Write a protein that binds this ligand. Structure first.
Ligand SMILES: Nc1ncnc2c1ncn2[C@@H]1O[C@@H]2COP(=O)(O)O[C@H]2[C@H]1O
Ligand SMILES: Nc1ncnc2c1ncn2[C@@H]1O[C@@H]2COP(=O)(O)O[C@H]2[C@H]1O
Lengths: 200, 200
DNA sequence: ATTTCGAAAAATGGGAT
DNA sequence: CTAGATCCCATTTTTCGAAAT
DNA sequence: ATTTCGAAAAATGGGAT
DNA sequence: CTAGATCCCATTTTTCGAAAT
């Protein structure tokens, strides 16, 4: 598109191999990122390193924007690269400037923020209102909306593990597995290895 | 500041008695809200009516932002007044106009959103990583610092129901009651009716 | 404002499963 | 195996309109 | 360089507490 | 109660880098 392009013009594009961490919770935040290509996972952990996945971000989403509005802010979570990433990088100081010349770019960001607030709130509702089976069903549909989810004549297909799912819904891999098996006995999904087919 | 008194001059002011509903989850979002005076509670309901408090918002806070960035959005949650409120209202349309003649007002909107994402993500963590006692201790500490908390010779005093505390942490009122009694057993808090004294 | 008084409505628990 | 969700009115507690200060 | 292939690694299946 | 958390291990998928084309 028009605007958003000009933005990348001041960002210092970089490359991050899969598994590499782009952001570390607790660091001083001074840089705003923009995933040009690839996808990352935003996650948090407890006092024992046990991790929960807050969200997946893909090509086109901004990253590390939370420290931009208040000074002296630290990174709110860890951002790990699920795949290989081509990430633009501009400093808050410079970004605040690009806003002046063209505020439409702040609007783009704010829209994405709004969306994350909606999703995160729904994630809170889920954690407080649904049992694991519910959270898992909802996450299966959600994963089916990701851009790296393939198509299937019976619906949609995703490639993910019972381990991962557990970190998204907040349960054990053992639990996920049992429920994944059950949902099969109801022909709601198709399970075999990292490959799961969600019937539409 | 100017920008505010200017913003408010284009807004339609409304008053709501405490406990009244300001926003209905589910309806079409076409209006922006700004709390001039008073405080509200943002909350979502389950299929059976069970309530989950997502946040308390006060003076200076914007409400109903989440619709602004995209067409056909519905209110993401219910907003009920805690105290009587004086709220400034403005359509999205009219608001998109004001942003263009001073996007600084959008900067402040975005600033609040970022904060909310931080707080809501941290809530996800708490629900995921902390047990009820942990969550309840956590909430009493935060409530103990809010604007409406009263000073007490032995610390800080708050008024709230076990029921409302459960709607904040995500557990039954019964559980709150038992945990509340155990916290007193450990001289951490004094509780008489809705009056809870958090020892400093 | 808010202190008082009598409902009327809300909020609590207790411990068994 | 085990934090807790549930069950449930008889009993508190608190809220509120009306009147008084 | 890119594809093939055969161990290591990582991810599971369920019953039991 | 009663969903889930945890244990335990021997088995299935997956992952990946040395080899081969
Ligand atoms: N709940 C969430 N949903 C989506 N993205 C998030 C969430 N929490 C944090 N992030 C992202 O993770 C980043 C961590 O560092 P920042 O706080 O700078 O900015 C944060 C956001 O980009
Ligand atoms: N997690 C949250 N934290 C704070 N405020 C919220 C949260 N979720 C929703 N809201 C507010 O409640 C509003 C409900 O309607 P909107 O979706 O228009 O906009 C929402 C925000 O104003």
């Amino acid at each position: 598109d028009p605007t958003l392009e000009w933005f990348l013009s001041h960002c210092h594009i970089h490359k991050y191999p899969s598994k590499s961490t782009l952001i570390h919770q607790g660091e001083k935040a001074e840089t705003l990122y923009y995933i040009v290509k690839g996808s990352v996972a935003v996650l948090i952990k407890d006092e024992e390193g046990k991790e929960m996945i807050l969200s997946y971000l893909n090509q086109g989403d901004f990253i590390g924007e939370l420290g931009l509005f208040e000074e002296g802010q630290e990174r709110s979570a860890w951002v790990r690269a699920k795949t290989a990433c081509e990430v633009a990088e501009i400093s808050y100081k410079k970004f605040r400037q690009l806003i002046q010349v063209n505020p439409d770019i702040l609007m783009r960001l704010s829209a994405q923020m709004a969306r994350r607030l909606q999703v995160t709130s729904e994630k809170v509702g889920n954690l407080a209102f649904l049992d694991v089976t519910g959270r898992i069903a909802q996450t299966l549909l959600n994963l089916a909306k990701q851009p790296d989810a393939m198509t299937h004549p019976d619906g949609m297909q995703i490639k993910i593990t019972r381990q991962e799912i557990g970190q998204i819904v907040g349960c054990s891999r053992e639990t996920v597995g049992r429920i994944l098996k059950m949902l099969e006995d109801q022909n709601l999904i198709s399970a075999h290895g990292k490959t799961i087919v969600v019937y539409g």
